Structure formats: C-alpha cells, structure tokens
From a paper:
The nucleosome remodeling and deacetylase ([name]) complex is a widely conserved transcriptional co-regulator that harbors both nucleosome remodeling and histone deacetylase activities. RbAp46 and [name] (RBBP7/[name]) are ∼50-kDa WD-repeat proteins that were first recognized for their ability to bind the tumor suppressor Rb. [name] has the seven-bladed β-propeller fold common to all WD40-repeat proteins but also displays three non-canonical features: an extended loop (the PP loop; Ref. 16) inserted into blade 6, a long additional N-terminal α-helix that contacts blades 6 and 7, and a single turn of C-terminal helix after blade 7. Our structures reveal that the [name] peptide binds in an amphipathic α-helical conformation in the groove on [name] formed by these three structural elements.
We, therefore crystallized two further [name]-[name] complexes, where the N terminus of each [name] peptide was defined by the structurally resolved region in our initial complex (residue 670). We extended the C terminus of each MTA peptide (either to residue 695 or 711) to explore the extent of the structured segment and collected diffraction data to 2.15 Å and 2.50 Å resolution, respectively. Two molecules of [name] and two molecules of [name] were found in the asymmetric unit of crystals formed from the complexes of [name] and [name]-(656–686 and 670–711), whereas one molecule of each polypeptide was observed in the asymmetric unit of [name]-[name]-(670–695). Rcryst and Rfree for each of the final refined models were, respectively, 18.2% and 22.5% for [name]-[name]-(656–686), 18.9% and 23.1% for [name]-[name]-(670–695), and 20.6% and 25.9% for [name]-[name]-(670–711). In all cases the data fitted well to a simple 1:1 binding isotherm, and dissociation constants from representative measurements were 2.3 ± 0.3, 0.05 ± 0.007, and 0.24 ± 0.16 μm for [name]-(656–686), [name]-(670–695), and [name]-(670–711), respectively (standard errors from single curve fits are given). The structures provide a rationale for the higher affinity observed for the [name]-(670–695) and [name]-(670–711) peptides as compared with [name]-(656–686). Residues Ile-688 and Leu-690 form a hydrophobic cluster with Leu-672. This cluster, which cannot form in the [name]-(656–686) peptide, interacts with the aromatic side chain of Phe-30 in [name]. Our crystal structures suggest why the affinities of the longer [name] peptides for [name] are substantially higher than those of histone H4 peptides for RbAp46 (KD of 0.05 μm for [name]-(670–695) and 0.2 μm for [name]-(670–711) versus 1 μm for H4-(1–48)). A tyrosine at position 685 in [name] is positioned in a narrow groove on the surface of [name], forming van der Waals contacts with residues that line the groove, but this residue is replaced with a glycine in histone H4.
Residue numbers in the entry:
A (entry chain B): 670 to 691
B (entry chain A): 2 to 89, 114 to 411
C-alpha cells in the first residue's frame, strides 16, 4: 500500500505521467 | 520551405523520448512482464504459433512467433522466432527467403507449419517451413511452395478458414477479395488460381476475416468506409449479404469475437473502434474512443470475452474491457478516458505495425513497431484482477 491497486489502475491509463509514490 | 517539417518532427521525437523515459521508469508497477528486443529489420506482421513446449523441471516455457522483415533494400525473409517466457531471451530459429517485405503472415490453423504471406506484389505466397532449410540460401532466391493469383495489386488482409481446411481469403488495394482452396493440392501445380473473387467494395480493401463458427461467413473492411458481411453460399459475389456504413473514414481492420458469434469489432482512420452485432448492423453498439490517430489492428483476447485490444499510428496499444461500459467516473478519471479503457501500453516509440495475443499465456501480448522494436509484455495482474 505504498501503491494501491486503485492508483495502479489509474496509472494504467496514464502511462506518460510518473507514478506518484506517496 | 520543407524545413519546418523535419524540425517539427524532431521536436515531436524529443517529446516522444521524454514520455518513453517516464514509461520505462513506470514499468515495475504496470507490468508483470516486459521484454524489449530490437529486430534486424522491422517486422510488419506478428502472430503467435499455437504450440508451446514446457521442459520438465524448468522455470520457463518456449513459444514461437511468425514474423517477417521489411528491409530498406536488402534480402527479405519470413521468420520464426522462439521466446522463452517465465513460468507459473528471444532467438531467430528459421529464416526463409522472401520476395519483398512481408506485409502479413498467418499460419493455417489445421496445419501450423503452413504459412501464407502477402507481398508488395499481387502474388499471395504460401510456404511450408518443414519443406525448407533453417538457414536461408545466400542467393536470396524465394522458392514458394505455392503461388496464388487473382489480384492485380498488393494488400494486407489475410485469413484462413478455421472450419474448412485450406480456404484462404485475401484483401487487395485492387478493391477485391480473393478466395483460394489450396486443399485442392495438385501433385506439384505450384501455382493456383482463385476460386472466387468478391467485388462489393469500391476502394482499397484493408482487411478480411473468416467468422470463427460459421464456415460460410466472412467480413471485409475497406477504404470506402464500409463493413461488408459475405456468405460464400450466395451466388452473387458483387453484392455482400450485409453492407454497413461503419465509420467516418477508412476502415483498416476487423476482428470477430471468439465467444460471441454475433459480435465483432472494426478499427478506423476515424480514431475509433466500433462494436457490432451482426443481427442488427444498422446500429453500432458502441464506439471506443481514446486513440489519437489511425487504428490499423484490432484483436479480441483469446481468453477473456469482454477484452479487446487496438493499435495504430499513435504509437499506443489500448486494451478495452466492455464490461466497464457505462460505469460512472470521478472527473479526474474521466480526464484519462472512458471507463472501458483498461490499459494503455506506452512502450513503443514508433507506429505499431501488428500485435498478437499469446494463446497459451493469458494477457501476454507481442507487439511490433516500425523502428525494429518487438515487445512481449503482460500488464500487472491487479489491473485486471478485481
């Protein structure tokens, strides 16, 4: 849960935006 | 002058490389597998062979791909590559001399050693790779096991009947679709002639595909913006059984759903994929939008009935899930695309020429682009597994 499945699904549709590790 | 174009391209290429850098850094989270491999020459075609071999005790399996070449000008080949895939390196295994670039190559389902190819010429070649050496002759002389005639020009569309062994359809820039029955093998005729020619289209025919259940039905799509449904039992070959105004631009591809005998998909220069019900072709079921440029390939998942993928000129491969159609989104999410858009593969940095879903490893895809790159990849399981 550094990265949720939900943020993973969202990142799946924004491949050119860096993934936000919060 | 013309200078503005080469400068504008170079600025674009610069954006493309930046985006690539970001995608590459993102891959650990988006993918359970990503393999990138630079081919000697670009391939215009890709298709997984049906066979897998799983060595005892080992942590991988071996799979194989029909590819081809597209040389600036040098000897062209038809290729069989092997791919080792992790379990639950890529190597060229066969090269066969080929008259020009391989526009498309497809194996016969009933005999996977047989492979049809489309060429820059009007000829549609057929090869049987078991009847050829692995190492091609340094002469570069292309000796095809058959040679099919009927077309006046090249094309792309190519489709073996999965219910009638040896029935081959083909599409051409000449506006026609040819059928061959190579089951009528002669001792060594070594050149065949077309059993039927279908002339319903009034422009370049971009693609053709047999229906997967009903041996008499096939679909074709063309630059006249039409989807046409043909029954080989009707005697009229100038007028299809159905003809649909499918898209607002050229129609480059179609794919029949392998679980739903009434459902198909078409992809277009209008930047959409259209969903169709053969029982009421007057009305499009849905239009999938997200692509930024012309779509050239569309393929249903062989494992998941609601899953479809599309590729084209925008360098992206999109994967769609129909079951998410109509779901509600936050505004942040809706900015990214419609709810049925499941995944955007951003691994490529040039036009995607073809892709193929692996028929033995769910979710594995192989995609090839114009800059020589071939990728074999599999999205992260939590993306789809919920």
């Amino acid at each position: 849960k550094l990265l949720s499945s939900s943020e993973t699904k969202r990142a799946a549709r924004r491949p050119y935006k860096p993934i936000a590790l919060r | 002058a013309d200078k503005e174009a080469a400068f504008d391209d170079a600025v674009e290429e610069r954006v493309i490389n930046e985006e690539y850098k970001i995608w590459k850094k993102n891959t650990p989270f988006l993918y359970d597998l990503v393999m990138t491999h630079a081919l000697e020459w670009p391939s215009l075609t890709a298709q997984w062979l049906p066979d897998v071999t799983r060595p005892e005790g080992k942590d991988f399996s071996i799979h194989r791909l029909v590819l081809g070449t597209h040389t600036s000008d040098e000897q062209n080949h038809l290729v069989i590559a092997s791919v080792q895939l992790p379990n639950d390196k890529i190597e060229i295994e066969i090269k066969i001399n080929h008259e020009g670039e391989v526009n498309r190559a497809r194996y016969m389902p009933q005999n996977p050693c047989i492979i049809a190819t489309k060429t820059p010429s009007s000829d549609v070649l057929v090869f049987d790779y078991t009847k050829h050496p692995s190492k091609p002759d340094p002469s570069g002389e292309c000796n095809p096991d058959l040679r099919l005639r009927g077309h006046q020009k090249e094309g792309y569309g190519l489709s073996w009947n999965p219910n009638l062994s040896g029935h081959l359809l083909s599409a051409s820039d000449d506006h026609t679709i040819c059928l061959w029955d190579i089951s009528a093998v002669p001792k060594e005729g070594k050149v065949v002639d077309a059993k039927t020619i279908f002339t319903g289209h009034t422009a370049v025919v971009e693609d053709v595909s047999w229906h997967l259940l009903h041996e008499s039905l096939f679909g074709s799509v063309a630059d006249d913006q039409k989807l046409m449904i043909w029954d080989t039992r009707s005697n009229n070959t100038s007028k299809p059984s159905h003809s649909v105004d499918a898209h607002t631009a050229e129609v480059n591809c179609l794919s029949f759903n392998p679980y739903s005998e009434f459902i198909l998909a078409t992809g277009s220069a209008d930047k959409t994929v259209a969903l169709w019900d053969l029982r009421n072709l007057k009305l499009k079921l849905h239009s999938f939008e997200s692509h930024k440029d012309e779509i050239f390939q569309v393929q249903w998942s062989p494992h998941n009935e609601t899953i479809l993928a599309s590729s084209g000129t925008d360098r992206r491969l999109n994967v769609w899930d129909l079951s998410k159609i109509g779901e509600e989104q936050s505004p942040e999410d809706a900015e990214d695309g419609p709810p049925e858009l499941l995944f955007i593969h951003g691994g490529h940095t040039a036009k995607i020429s073809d892709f193929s879903w692996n028929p033995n490893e769910p979710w594995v895809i192989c995609s090839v682009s114009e800059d020589n790159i071939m990728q074999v990849w599999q999205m992260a399981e939590n993306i789809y597994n919920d």
